[PDB]
From a paper:
Among the most extensively studied orphan receptors are the chicken ovalbumin upstream promoter-transcription factors (COUP-TFs), which belong to the NR2F subfamily. In mammals, the COUP-TF orphan NRs regulate many key biological processes, including angiogenesis, neuronal development, organogenesis, cell fate determination, metabolic homeostasis, and circadian rhythm. Here we demonstrate that COUP-TFII is a ligand-regulated nuclear receptor that can be activated by unphysiological micromolar concentrations of retinoic acids. COUP-TFs are the most evolutionarily conserved NRs among all species, and within the NR2F subfamily, the homology in both the DNA-binding domain (DBD) and ligand-binding domain (LBD) is extremely high.
Here we report the 1.48 Å crystal structure of the LBD of human COUP-TFII. The human COUP-TFII LBD was purified to homogeneity in a ligand-free state. There is one LBD molecule per asymmetric unit, but COUP-TFII forms a symmetric dimer through crystal packing. The structure contains 10 α helices that are folded into a typical three-layered helical sandwich seen in other NRs. The dimer interface is made up of residues involved in hydrophobic interactions and hydrogen bonding, with the majority of the hydrophobic interactions observed between residues found on the N-terminal half of helix α10 of each monomer, which forms a parallel coiled-coil structure in the crystal. In the absence of ligand, helix α10 bends at V373 and causes the C-terminal portion of α10 to collapse into the lower half of the receptor, the region where ligands have been found to bind in other NR LBDs. Due to the bulky size of these aromatic side chains and the dense pack of the binding pocket in COUP-TFII, there is no room for any ligand to bind in this conformation. The kink in helix α10 and the subsequent collapse of the binding pocket of COUP-TFII allows the AF2 helix, which follows α10, to bind in the cofactor binding site of the LBD. The N-terminal end of AF2 is stabilized by a hydrogen bond between Q393 (AF2) and R246 (α4), and the C-terminal end of the AF2 is stabilized by hydrogen bonding between the conserved charge clamp residue R228 (α3) and two backbone carbonyl groups from residues M399 and L400 (AF2). In this orientation of the AF2 helix, neither coactivators nor corepressors are able to bind to COUP-TFII, and therefore this structure represents an autorepressed form of this orphan NR.
Author numbering: 171 to 193, 207 to 268, 286 to 407
């Protein structure tokens, strides 16, 4: 913005404000997973810029990234992870490290919200209509993150690069494993990527 430094800060505050949570019958692990997914989509509907993208671009971005946002939200919310002391466990084991590494870096709420924006605004999605604009938005998100981290963590000079190096691992987590682990009772069967568009068009608040 036109005081760049303060407007990058205002951005992060808006990314934060978009989060539904802080972010009787006690959620079970699969209800917890559905909330982590729905909250990703609701957060995306309420951040700056995303909702103004053409709808088909919004769908393309979420279809690719939902699993990475899912992982970010699962780490953020400390979703219980070894859990069924029933499960596989190659599946259980590979979701797990990524969560554990983000918690190990003590990623803060701000950093989570930036990382989710950087993940969402990816020009890797198939079928985008305005790739330059999405890139610009990712550049803004990364430039916001960099500024935050240099100012909040001035004695951890490598922190920015460590946070960015979480990204490739997100991109390798398998969508099918996440589905198999958490979403089968809810969905079968059906790949989440095929239901994302309905999800985005559902989903409540005026805010």
């Amino acid at each position: 913005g036109s005081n760049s430094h303060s407007y990058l800060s205002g951005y992060i505050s808006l990314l934060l404000r978009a989060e539904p949570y802080p972010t009787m019958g006690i959620e079970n692990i699969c209800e917890l997973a559905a909330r982590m997914l729905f909250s990703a989509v609701e957060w995306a509907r309420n951040i700056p810029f995303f909702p103004d993208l053409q709808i088909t671009d919004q769908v393309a971005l979420l279809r690719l990234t939902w699993s990475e946002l899912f992982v970010l939200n699962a780490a953020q919310c400390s979703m219980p992870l070894h859990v069924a002391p029933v499960a596989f466990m190659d599946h259980i084991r590979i979701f797990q490290e990524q969560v554990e590494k983000l918690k190990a870096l003590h990623v803060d709420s701000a950093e989570y919200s930036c990382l989710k924006a950087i993940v969402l605004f990816t020009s890797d999605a198939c079928g985008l209509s305005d790739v330059a604009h999405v890139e610009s938005l990712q550049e803004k998100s990364q430039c916001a993150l960099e500024e935050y981290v240099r100012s909040q963590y001035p004695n951890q000079p490598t922190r920015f690069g460590k946070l960015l190096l979480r990204l490739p691992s997100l991109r390798t987590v398998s969508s099918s494993v996440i589905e198999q682990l958490f979403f089968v009772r809810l969905v079968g069967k059906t790949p989440i990527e095929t239901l994302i568009r309905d999800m985005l068009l559902s989903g409540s608040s005026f805010n």
